[PDB]
């Protein structure tokens, strides 16, 4: 029992950090964006993770219990976000590093800032360029995207370990 | 009182997020690195934030409280870490956007991967290049660094609001 208030607190913090990383990942970076962003996963995931903080309401055993049983359904929906989010992140991390299993068109107001760029292929057509600074930028950006996605993966996984009765 | 167990839980989550963003920010990205990374702040801050979770101990009032009084010093030093961490981030965010108030040499094994890059000046000497993709690459990297630092700023600030408790 008394762990439950603490667990709720942890769940809420874990929900805010998804909003943070999801926003940061959406900064313009080419015509193609990671699947999870085109799915808008970080926003719904975070929102559901917070609502599932309902156990912060504590055990109001007044009358028939005021943690209303519909809340168990409420708890139950949030588990659906943890699995699907983990699978999405582990899919995107593959699209960056072997080949496009999928491609997604980003969003139009994002494209307005990086229309001539991709990050999923990164090697120049002209071999004279293989040491040009222009190429070192592209590998650095790939490494940042792999980083952000791997941190999302681990903190998302940290829900599934606990968001269950 | 009964807020305190919760506050401790929140403090621990907030501590792990600093380890995460600190590692991500240290990915090779040029000869100059943000002051906070060269100060090595993201590690010590997070560590002291977790240690200051010592209020995670139950309030054992056994004749005199088992929260040994030295822990109050522990809590206080962690508040010093919170203030200093905030100031460092709001300094770094200025060095990106007007000019170098300071420059710091990064670390040698970082430079081994981005020896010909700087993110602090980003404009081509050759005006024919002002629409070359290489410039859009550089501005995108600046925007990612501003993002990471601003998220660090706001989550660090979220200690000082409460670690005084």
């Amino acid at each position: 029992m008394r762990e439950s208030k603490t667990l709720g607190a942890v769940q809420i913090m874990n929900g805010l950090f998804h909003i943070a990383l999801g926003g940061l990942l959406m900064i313009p970076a080419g015509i193609y964006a990671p699947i999870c962003v085109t799915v808008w996963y970080p926003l719904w995931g975070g929102i559901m993770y917070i609502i599932s903080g309902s156990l912060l309401a504590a055990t109001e055993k007044n009358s028939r219990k005021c943690l209303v049983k519909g809340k168990m359904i409420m708890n139950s929906l949030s588990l659906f976000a943890a699995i699907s989010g983990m699978i999405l992140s582990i899919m995107d991390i593959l699209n960056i590093k072997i080949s496009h299993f999928l491609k997604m068109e980003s969003l139009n107001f994002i494209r307005a800032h990086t229309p001539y760029i991709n990050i999923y292929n990164c090697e120049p057509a002209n071999p004279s360029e293989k040491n040009s600074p222009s190429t070192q930028y592209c590998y650095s950006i790939q490494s940042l995207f792999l980083g952000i996605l791997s941190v999302m993966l681990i903190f998302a996984f940290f829900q599934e370990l606990v968001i269950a009765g | 009182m009964r807020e305190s167990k919760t506050l401790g839980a929140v403090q621990i989550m907030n501590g792990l997020f600093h380890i995460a963003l600190g590692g991500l920010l240290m990915i090779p990205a040029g000869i100059y690195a943000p002051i906070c990374v060269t100060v090595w702040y993201p590690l010590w801050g997070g560590i002291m934030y977790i240690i200051s979770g010592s209020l995670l101990a139950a309030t054992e009032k056994n004749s005199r409280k088992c929260l040994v009084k030295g822990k109050m010093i522990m809590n206080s030093l962690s508040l010093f870490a919170a203030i200093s961490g905030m100031i460092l981030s709001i300094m770094d965010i200025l060095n990106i956007k007007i000019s170098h108030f300071l420059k710091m040499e990064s670390l040698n094994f970082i430079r081994a991967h981005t020896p010909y890059i700087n993110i602090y000046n980003c404009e081509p000497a050759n005006p024919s290049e002002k629409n070359s993709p290489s410039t859009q690459y550089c501005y995108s990297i600046q925007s990612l660094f501003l993002g990471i630092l601003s998220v660090m700023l706001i989550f660090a600030f979220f200690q000082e609001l409460v670690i005084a408790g």
Partner: antibody
Amino acid sequence: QVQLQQPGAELVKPGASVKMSCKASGYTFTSYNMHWVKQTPGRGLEWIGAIYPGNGDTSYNQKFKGKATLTADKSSSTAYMQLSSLTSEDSAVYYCARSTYYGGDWYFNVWGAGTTVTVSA
Amino acid sequence: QIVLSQSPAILSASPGEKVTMTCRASSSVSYIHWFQQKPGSSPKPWIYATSNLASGVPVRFSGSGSGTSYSLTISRVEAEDAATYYCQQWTSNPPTFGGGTKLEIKR
């Protein structure tokens, strides 16, 4: 003045291999990238790959990465392409081309006369 | 890899007409380059960087466009203008050529 020279045609037995050459003249050979292009009446123009004779770095289109192999003689000013395991699909015209950075973008400013390959038993 | 679509497939005009032909890319590109080929020769470079005429190209030609949409235009076609025109891009790997446009003479 600048020119690229190629032999006119090749006859090859099926399944054998063929090697064909593009020779440069009139410029500093080691200072520019050399590019290869394939034309057919059914699929237009396709780009095979390139070599930088200044050091031997190469790049390939994945669709051809198993077929071709590019090499250069830094002394004799001659580029070679080798094709292996030829089939009826390969009968096409092959060009070398020189590319230069000009006016803010690359462009193919000089082209060879082209070589015709026929695959037939 | 991005694909360039050209239209029309066959373009038809009388001497002294104005004519235009268009290339549309599936994604926005920095520049389009245009080439001319006739049967039995290598392609020739014709327009580079969207709007700069190559050496010796007659002033009848001009080029224009931006973003995803580009055009090439001929002010007064002449009997020597009969050829096939390919558009080309270098914005991404690999560089790609369009499907070509063939120019006829009306009679």
